[PDB]
Amino acid sequence: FSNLERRLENLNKKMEDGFLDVWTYNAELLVLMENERTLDFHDSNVKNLYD
Amino acid sequence: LCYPGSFNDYEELKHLLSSVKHFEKVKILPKDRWTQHTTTGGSRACAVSGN
């Protein structure tokens, strides 16, 4: 961008930062939610053999 | 603009002023350097107390 396109450069930056926060947040919760379920899954499976 | 007109790249200036906070007003071209010219012009559009 040129020095007379500061609002356009800022629009570009914001768009890119916005998507980065969305993907980072989703990556963090997908991993935590999936790990909660993986461990419950394994506990369920050993109990299922028991019954 | 008390004297009707326009300001170029005004939105870019307003954007520039966002990341500024304080600034110092500095005299660059003192009015009295303009000898051989009239520096006392003006308009009723920007009048103060009629004048």
Q: Nearest CA to CA, how far is A35 from chain B (Å)?
A: 43
- Do the chains contact at A6 and B15, CB–CB below 8 Å? yes
| Phi, psi dihedral angles at B33 (to 5 degrees) | -80, -15
**By what method was this entry solved?**
cryo-EM
DSSP string, B11-24: HHHHHHTTTT----
Residue B11 to residue A10, Cβ atoms within 8 A: no
What is the rounded CA–CA span in Å between residue A25 and residue A33?
Answer: 12
What's the rounded Cα separation, in Å, for the pair A6 and A17? Answer: 16
Tokens of A26: 């989703």
Distance between CA atoms of residues B26 and B18, nearest Å = 20
